[PDB]
Design a protein around this nucleic acid. Sequence first.
RNA 1: CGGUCCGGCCGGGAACUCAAAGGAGACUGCCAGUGAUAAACUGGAGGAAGGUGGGGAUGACGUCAAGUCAUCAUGGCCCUUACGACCAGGGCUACACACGUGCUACAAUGGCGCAUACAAAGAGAAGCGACCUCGCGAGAGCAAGCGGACCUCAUAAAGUGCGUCGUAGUCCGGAUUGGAGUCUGCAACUCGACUCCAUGAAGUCGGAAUCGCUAGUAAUCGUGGAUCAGAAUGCCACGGUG
Lengths: 99, 127, 114, 100, 79, 206, 151
Amino acid sequence: QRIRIRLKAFDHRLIDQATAEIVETAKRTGAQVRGPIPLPTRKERFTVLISPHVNKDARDQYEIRTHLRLVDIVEPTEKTVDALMRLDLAAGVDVQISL
Amino acid sequence: NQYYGTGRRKSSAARVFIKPGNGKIVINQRSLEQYFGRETARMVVRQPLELVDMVEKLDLYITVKGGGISGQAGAIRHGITRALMEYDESLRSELRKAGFVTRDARQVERKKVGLRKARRRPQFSKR
Amino acid sequence: ARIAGINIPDHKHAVIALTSIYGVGKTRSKAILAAAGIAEDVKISELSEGQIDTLRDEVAKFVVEGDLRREISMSIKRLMDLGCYRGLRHRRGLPVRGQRTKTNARTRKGPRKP
Amino acid sequence: AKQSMKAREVKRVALADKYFAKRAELKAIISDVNASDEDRWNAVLKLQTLPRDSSPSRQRNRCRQTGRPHGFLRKFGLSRIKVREAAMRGEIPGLKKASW
Amino acid sequence: RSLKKGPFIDLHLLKKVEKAVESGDKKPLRTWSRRSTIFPNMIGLTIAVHNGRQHVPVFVTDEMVGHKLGEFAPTRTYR
Amino acid sequence: GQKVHPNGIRLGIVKPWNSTWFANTKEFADNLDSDFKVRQYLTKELAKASVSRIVIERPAKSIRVTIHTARPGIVIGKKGEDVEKLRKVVADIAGVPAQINIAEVRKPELDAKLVADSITSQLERRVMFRRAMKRAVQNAMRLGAKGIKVEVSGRLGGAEIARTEWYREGRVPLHTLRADIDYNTSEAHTTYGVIGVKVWIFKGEI
Amino acid sequence: PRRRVIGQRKILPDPKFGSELLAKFVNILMVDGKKSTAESIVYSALETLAQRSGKSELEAFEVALENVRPTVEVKSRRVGGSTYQVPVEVRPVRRNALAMRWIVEAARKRGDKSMALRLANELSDAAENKGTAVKKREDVHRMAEANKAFA
RNA sequence: CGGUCCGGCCGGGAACUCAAAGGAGACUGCCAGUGAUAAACUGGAGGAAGGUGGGGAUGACGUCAAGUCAUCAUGGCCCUUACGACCAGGGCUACACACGUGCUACAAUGGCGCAUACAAAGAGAAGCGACCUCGCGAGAGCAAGCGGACCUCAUAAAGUGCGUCGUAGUCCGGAUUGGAGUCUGCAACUCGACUCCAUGAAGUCGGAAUCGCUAGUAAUCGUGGAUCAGAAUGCCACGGUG
Ligand SMILES: [Mg+2]
Ligand SMILES: [Mg+2]
Ligand SMILES: [Mg+2]
Ligand SMILES: [Mg+2]
Ligand SMILES: [Mg+2]
Ligand SMILES: [Mg+2]
Ligand SMILES: [Mg+2]
Ligand SMILES: [Mg+2]
């Protein structure tokens, strides 16, 4: 069928590096690959009072951006499956596979 | 081949496909009259066909999402002109002078901490 | 015309005129004109005496006016006799349903005294 | 906060998992069961004899580093003050001052 | 107020109402259950309902049924 | 007025995060507290090992601590011993299995945290604050700092009226987001209370 | 405006008649950004005024505006501890704006049933130079001619 | 383009909308005037943007022994079979008053009914909860989908159309109170939110005085979030008309 990998991480330059790794590996190991597609970034936000007591207008405004990548692999050639499946990827990337 | 123009305004975005023959207008599968209950806004989509002349000369087939009434009508205005310029580009000087080429960049301004709105400030008591 | 309240509804649209009764707001008024068989936007004109006493019949099913007022006062008297919090509030001219009194309890308190 | 106030939370957490995970769930379901025991269930009585600190609603979210019961953020398990202090040292991943 | 499925009452007070019934009345019953719903089987007794500091004697009555016990024990002194 | 935290403002720009794992809302809090408990543990046991910085990341079901230290042999101890005993209790605290990495702080006098701690420890020894600061500055510059300042606050020398004082050589553009500004902190618990030390070091731009 | 002088936004013309002037009018009558509902009231008032009062819709408008247009006014000023009243000769563009503004304000301060009927009857009154709005011009002049000495 | 359940729905198409990573672009650069041939300003062109284009973050040396020992930390001091500690009920919600900040109004630029077009940005597994069914209703039962550009919260409201009310303390306004209920929670008396029926205060535009705002701003209209079992007219954020 197909194997699709969802990649999410807080850092972009680092996420598409992990993406790049996977795609290339696939492309070299003679897999056919749809993607990588940029799936919309879900940015949480936080607003917190900046003073320990009172001064309600004094605040910090933080956000955590969560980046999303879809890697779609058309042919699951076993060499490809082994190629991918012991890649060494950035620790701070969460990798999901659909089967 | 179709002649195309993208137009957008506020959070709206209108795609605009030109072809010769008639005074037909179909926004989102619907008629111009049907889509816009306001007849003024109807005029703005017509405008790019003023200086540039269509009566029964070309078909514009369009669609749009985002924003509201005037956003969608502004955005379509904009996209037509781009599709007109696509057809010749000589036309522009007229369109420039019209004010129709420009992408109106005025977005709603964000709401800021300590303020009631983007600028409205909490009423100030002296004592 | 007059109705259970022995009150005289205005001359103008029916659904609003029935509101003149005490104990008949819009939901009852709508339901009655509907429970009778009348149109809601009709005036007293052409609403004939045969159609007016057939409305009296339908409204008769609700407790209204003196009957309702008595029924409402007695319910309050009960709280007061009963000696409960609710009753003490009614007897002390202060709000019954928890609302603040440090400020703004003024409908209940009545206009202020310096 | 006080040591004793922190201690109170832990007791509450513990009881909540011990009882009102399963036993309270069953009792609540059974009080809630429309189809049966419409009159003599006794469950409502037994739910009451349980420790109060077994109910989860009795738990209060506190800054995990200091015990603060105010200004708490579930995302980080901290109060805004310790969120910011950890934020500026870069100890909250992905987080930074944001504008837009 | 409370959903119709279940009328609420503290157990310890309820059993207190039981024994007060069978064994004939005593002097005031001491209770803090300002939250429990008054039942018909309390009509007669005198339940002493805490108000934060003292226990208010309350002569229970037919019309008191359904109400809360706390409704009869004023908690704030207003002079 | 109040100044923005110069490490914080530069995150993503020219300064790295010190925690760099990913996690969903479920366990983000738990991870963040676990981070706190390990950093605390290590920071005490290695108090005299000149630990300037602890990086934590969490690959799969793992955690690996990097201890940036100006005294690696201390932290490591005879043939891996001390590393190992740290590992076994980090893994306890962390829940998941654990690995420890050790990165040399080559020039600690350029490390704001070890500068700040060094002054901190010196106030506790009973050194004079103008000296300690001025040794820090001089040192920092002769080793190629573009600039440095160190501040000291509260009850200098045991003075009854609390004072704030700083020294500054070279260049410290705090408004330049490009500027490699290494900023950190330390508190001196003294017989007459707490003396805070702030330190900034400018190392060039981009 | 201490330092920065400016131009002025040059609003689009009235959609129906293509008049910038009436665009200044609908906007002035507009409330809560209800443009759609503002021009509706201006036209129906012009339509009420046009239909049954000799037509010439743009011209009818001018006949009324001609009457509430003020030639001079006073600008308050504080010199040597004194609040003097200096009568200033006012420029044409604003002359229209005051004229339009007083017509609109007098219309809402009126007894009739809707703003359109009110607006219509204000224009009519102004057209015959009578009513509140004209009177607003006259007070401006009485107030101006009085301090004629300090021009 | 092929196929019609007339649904991007399936073949596909990779064009366009959009997603997000990288890049170009705007610098008084050009022309003209003013201005000591200076800086600069002004006007025009080209241009999506023109003179720091719009918004934000960014807050120097310092002032006020300004605020926080109750976030935490901490010198000194004080209690220690009590100033610590456990539990139940109460109080923080009181009410002759005064002040500050707000919401909702007084209405036809409106109220009501029916019909109906167009957003943005968020949230979600002890969660968001569709469809179906029951209840006038708040909701309840049953039960998919979804750790989500897929599923759900979730029908935007202003607006436009037709009809009605016809300037009245009203078909304006909703306070207050009676009655009966829903759900959360061991538990809604003191004190939760919401619904149904009935009630229908003051208020017909506010003295002296006083605040915000220079443009997608003010004004006005809805929308979401944090905290949170439940409890927003506050707070933080979103776009519509303008
Ligand atoms: Mg009535
Ligand atoms: Mg403590
Ligand atoms: Mg709670
Ligand atoms: Mg870009
Ligand atoms: Mg700057
Ligand atoms: Mg002081
Ligand atoms: Mg009403
Ligand atoms: Mg300004």
